[PDB]
């Protein structure tokens, strides 16, 4: 047979690639396994090439070497990068032909019943690039490409060779090589999912379990839940770092390296090591697509009164409508209120509570010093990314800062305004749904520009109005004792107040800098001085 | 010509047999020749098969083939010496047997590698001199194949050296049918192919495919059928008990077509259907009036001799359904050329880009015999803001000029513009440019609203009775798009609250003109 009779999937050690390996076997190794008679009756030819590609550290080389191990054949030939190039003219092609000489001789000698020969190319893009589009200085590269093309499939027919190639940039490869007969099976390797992450971790923890060197408090399922966007190499590095942390307890240094011995026979790896390494040693190379919600919500949310709940309720309702509607695949809403009321935090909370696959926030904090064309390009890119998903949500905050508005004259950028109107009007591709949430603090200006009618609904976000709400907020914050609260109530309860929560936090922080006998008076003075408002 | 196993190139081979071997087969006395052929085309079209079968068909010596740049050598004088070893036998036969000499065939594979600096130019010069030099041969034929014909040296293509230039192209439906027959005959002969499979459907489906891709698709189908009798996970198996009985169903071919092979060419995207989503429902007389006016304008454009150009403007308030009716009129026009110009396709552009796009659309329109063009959201096209106000004058002037330029002699053009702000256009002095105008109104009375709700069929009788109690005795002012939005918002809550929420929203939106 062509398969080493001592073989199994488990001993290979590949975690997350189940569909890909099955497809590879199905599409490349079915012909050589069945009885020759039926194959001859069908009169079909065998595959001669495979192309693996993907992002770094996903398992291409591991897959290739395991495949080489799986077969019973001659030892595979490996080409390590551009180790074929030479300075004397005509010597690269000789090196290339030396690779196929043995297979050609064996085929000529034995006919159709000869063995298989495997050749592996790594970093294939180094040697194989488009003949026409390259540095027009020396013709060595084009001749190398021509020789390879001729040798793989020439006038003389060679049919007992399999060629594997792996790369990181598939596009650069010349098209004439990626056609049926040379390399038709083109697989893609990508980042794993939760199940694949669990499989990889279980693969890499087995030997530690076998010899009773792993603590029972470790839970691999929780680890797989936590490690989001990690890859195989990172998942192995995390285990290596945890093992190093566990080992370092028994070594004493800073004058001479001593490794104990009495206590070196009772070593175990706990969960504290994993938790410590997750936060100090390893960071995912792929930038977290998850939004940094902690930045937008920095002090949580406290239910100081009724309106908060109401606002959230409205948002929930809107979400439901955009999830269970087909006549209106696009919905919009605008949050407006006085300054320092907490519109951005509420919008972020509403966006987060939903479970949509795609969620992004567009802010002016990133477009500093940008022209009015760069802003349009950025918005267009964000919306283009949004269109791909089946369910999308987008948040546009600080609209007045996105248009460069100043009341003197006034002045603003018109290109961004027109782009925003057009984007708000149009709908996504067929069978997809999009939700948009806008935030602003000046509604009359937007009304003048005639964009308030482009939205579908509006929600109002008021600030603290009565003294009872102020007392509730203070109780939730817990910055003052009961004795101080009695004094504060004795004055505030009589009348109404008009202040935002952010300003309230600022005032509290400013007040707490005085000596204990003066803090209440400072707070009252600040509230009376800055509180002149409706 | 299908015997050789290549389909879709019968005519090319007829040309070959005419232009190449007619002199050799024609009786010698009346004759009392051509020595160059170059085949080019995209990869996988059967050039190697052509060369091999050409070598086999003639009764001559075994052809000599050089595989790529084997001639190049590190030493001096070896690259040129390698070429002279190819023609030794031809010279010997020419000098000994004279005219009565056998034909010699030379095949050059990837000839662009050695023809196109001391080595390469000397090689090319030696080849040129040997093929056509002081001594003239009449019993040699040289064949070359290329995938990049634009990288070959010009001096090699002159008459007397490379005469017969040929192009291989992607086969048409009949050629693809021939190829599928060739690659499925072996399966059919042994009854290993299921009876449900139709070759004609496969031929119609496989658009833009080449021969190699078709053979790969067939191979993928075979592999899909074969894997059914293969076991993995623990060890590789052949089954045998069921493998002996292997049939290739249609599902295998369909699945192989979905993923394993792809055409590898581009795709076209259509947007017109997007402009009418919910259709047109007749809730009153005005829609019929608008459609009748559109038909009158279309007929006037069709049967006019000294008014080849006609323009119209559609007027109405927001959320009234103007673009949908314009698209409907354009569709009912039944003109060979129809297009829609929208600002959705131009986001972030400057004035010059918009002008160029509009000019390109109108240039395309001018080529046909009778054409129709619709422009919607004029105020968005020439971006307008009430503050200042501010707008783009270049686009305004371009539109003004284009609105009164007639097409070439004997051709017809219709233009339909839509807007929701007529006073602004009147101030710009563009309302005069158009020939006529039409008005698109809102829903005015409660009877029309009830008819529209009946057509939509969202509410049942019990709630319609209460709605009629509330609305029938009053005037209303609402669009249809906003009406659908309101209905969808109201439907969200539980069945108890729906009517009250709907009427609360209606009261919120109530207004008068």
């Amino acid at each position: 047979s062509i398969i080493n009779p001592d073989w199994n999937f488990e001993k290979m050690g590949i975690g997350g690639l189940d569909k890909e390996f099955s497809d590879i076997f199905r599409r490349a190794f079915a012909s050589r396994v069945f009885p020759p008679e039926i194959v001859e009756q069908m009169g079909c030819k065998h595959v001669k090439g495979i192309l693996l590609y993907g992002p770094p550290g996903c398992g291409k080389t591991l897959l290739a070497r395991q495949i080489g191990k799986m077969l019973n054949a001659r030892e595979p030939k490996v080409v390590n990068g551009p180790e074929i190039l030479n300075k004397y003219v005509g010597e690269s092609e000789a090196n290339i032909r030396k690779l196929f000489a043995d297979a050609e001789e064996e085929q000529r000698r034995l006919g159709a019943n000869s063995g298989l020969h495997i050749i592996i190319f790594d970093e294939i893009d180094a040697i194989c690039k488009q003949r026409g589009s390259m540095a027009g200085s020396t013709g060595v590269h084009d001749t190398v490409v021509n020789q390879l093309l001729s040798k793989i499939d020439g006038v003389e027919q060679l049919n007992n060779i399999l060629v594997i190639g792996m790369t990181n940039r598939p596009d650069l490869i010349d098209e004439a090589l990626l056609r049926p007969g040379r390399l038709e099976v083109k697989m893609e390797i990508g980042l794993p999912d939760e199940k694949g992450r669990l499989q990889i971790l279980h693969i890499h923890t087995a030997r530690m379990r076998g010899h009773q060197l792993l603590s029972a408090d470790v839970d691999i399922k929780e680890l797989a839940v936590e490690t989001k966007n990690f890859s195989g190499a990172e998942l192995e590095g995390l285990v290596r770092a945890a093992q190093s942390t566990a080992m370092n307890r028994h070594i004493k240094a800073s004058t001479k390296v001593e490794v104990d011995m009495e206590k070196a026979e009772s070593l175990q790896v706990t969960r504290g090591d994993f938790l410590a390494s997750l936060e100090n040693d390893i960071k995912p190379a792929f930038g977290t697509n998850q939004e940094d919600y902690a930045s937008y919500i920095m002090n949580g949310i406290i239910k100081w009164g009724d309106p908060v709940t109401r606002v959230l309720d409205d948002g929930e309702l809107l979400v439901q409508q955009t999830k269970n509607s087909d006549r209106t695949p696009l919905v919009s809403v605008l949050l407006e209120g006085p300054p320092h009321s907490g519109k951005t935090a509420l919008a972020a909370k509403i966006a987060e509570e939903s479970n949509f696959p795609f969620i992004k926030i567009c802010s002016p904090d990133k477009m500093i010093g940008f022209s009015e064309t760069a802003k349009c390009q950025a918005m267009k890119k964000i919306f283009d990314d949004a269109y791909k998903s089946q369910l999308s949500c987008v948040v546009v905050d600080d609209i007045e800062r996105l248009l460069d508005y100043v009341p003197i004259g006034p002045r603003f950028s018109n290109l961004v305004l027109q782009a925003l109107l057009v984007l708000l009007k149009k709908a996504p591709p067929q069978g997809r749904k999009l939700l948009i949430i806008g935030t602003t603090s000046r509604k009359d200006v937007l009304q003048e520009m005639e964009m308030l009618n482009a939205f579908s609904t509006t929600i109002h976000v008021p600030n603290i109005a009565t003294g009872e709400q102020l007392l509730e907020a203070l109780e939730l914050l817990g910055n003052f004792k009961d004795k101080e609260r009695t004094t504060i109530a004795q004055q505030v309860k009589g009348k109404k107040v008009w202040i935002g929560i952010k300003k309230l936090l600022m005032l509290i922080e400013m007040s707490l800098q005085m000596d204990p006998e003066y803090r209440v008076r400072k707070f009252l003075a600040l509230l009376r001085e800055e509180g002149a408002s409706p | 010509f299908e015997k050789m196993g290549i389909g879709g190139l019968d005519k090319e081979f007829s040309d070959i047999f005419r232009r190449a071997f007619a002199s050799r087969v024609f009786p010698p006395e009346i004759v009392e020749h051509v020595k160059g052929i170059l085949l080019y085309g995209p990869p996988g079209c059967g050039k190697t098969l052509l060369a091999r079968q050409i070598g086999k068909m003639l009764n001559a010596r075994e052809p000599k083939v050089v595989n790529g740049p084997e001639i190049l050598n590190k030493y001096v004088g070896e690259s040129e010496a390698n070429i002279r070893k190819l023609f030794a036998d031809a010279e010997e036969e020419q000098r000994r047997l004279g005219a009565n000499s056998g034909l010699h065939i030379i095949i050059f594979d990837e000839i662009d590698a050695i023809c196109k600096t001391g080595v390469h130019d000397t090689v090319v010069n030696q080849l040129l001199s040997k093929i056509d030099g002081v001594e003239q041969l009449n019993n040699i034929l040289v064949i070359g194949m290329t995938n990049r014909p634009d990288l070959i040296d010009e001096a090699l293509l002159r008459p007397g050296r490379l005469e017969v230039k040929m192009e291989i192209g992607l086969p048409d439906e009949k050629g693809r049918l021939q190829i599928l027959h060739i690659h499925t005959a072996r399966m059919r002969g042994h009854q290993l192919l299921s009876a449900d499979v139709d070759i004609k459907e496969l031929a119609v489906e496989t658009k833009n495919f080449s021969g190699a891709e078709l053979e790969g698709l067939v191979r993928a189908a075979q592999s899909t059928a074969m894997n059914r009798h293969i076991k993995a996970s623990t060890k590789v198996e052949v089954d045998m008990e069921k493998a002996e009985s292997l049939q290739v169903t249609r599902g295998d071919f369909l699945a192989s077509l979905e993923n394993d092979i792809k055409p590898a060419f581009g795709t076209n995207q259509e947007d017109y259907a997007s402009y009418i989503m919910n259709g047109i429902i007749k809730w009153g007389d005005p829609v019929t009036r608008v459609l009748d006016d559109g038909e009158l304008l279309v007929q006037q454009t069709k049967n006019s001799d000294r008014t080849p150009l006609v323009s119209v403007l559609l007027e109405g308030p927001p959320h009234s359904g103007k673009t949908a009716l314009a698209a409907k009129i354009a569709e009912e026009s039944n003109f060979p050329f129809i297009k829609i110009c929208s600002p959705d396709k131009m986001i972030g552009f400057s004035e010059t880009a918009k002008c160029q796009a509009m000019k390109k659309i109108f240039d395309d329109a001018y080529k046909s015999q009778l054409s129709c063009v619709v422009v919607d959201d004029i105020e968005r096209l020439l971006d307008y803001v009430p503050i200042g106000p501010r707008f783009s004058n270049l686009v305004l002037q371009a539109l003004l000029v284009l609105l009164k330029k007639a097409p070439p002699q004997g051709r017809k053009l219709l233009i339909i513009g839509t807007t929701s702000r007529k006073d602004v256009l009147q101030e710009m002095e563009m309302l005069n440019a158009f020939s006529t105008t039409i008005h698109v109104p809102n829903i005015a009375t409660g009877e029309q609203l009830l008819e529209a709700l009946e057509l939509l069929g969202n509410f049942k009788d019990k709630e319609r009775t209460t709605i009629a109690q509330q609305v029938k005795g009053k005037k209303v002012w609402i669009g249809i798009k906003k009406l659908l939005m309101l209905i969808e918002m109201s439907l969200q809550m539980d069945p108890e609250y729906r009517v009250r929420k709907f009427l609360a929203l209606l009261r919120e939106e109530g207004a008068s003109p």
Binding site: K87, Y88, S137, T138, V140 | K74, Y75, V76, G118, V119
Partner: peptide, 16 residues
């Protein structure tokens, strides 16, 4: 316009 900048070269050897 600006005139294309200066560029480096690669070299190839030959035996005899």
């Amino acid at each position: 316009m600006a005139e294309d900048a200066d560029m480096r070269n690669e070299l190839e050897e030959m035996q005899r």
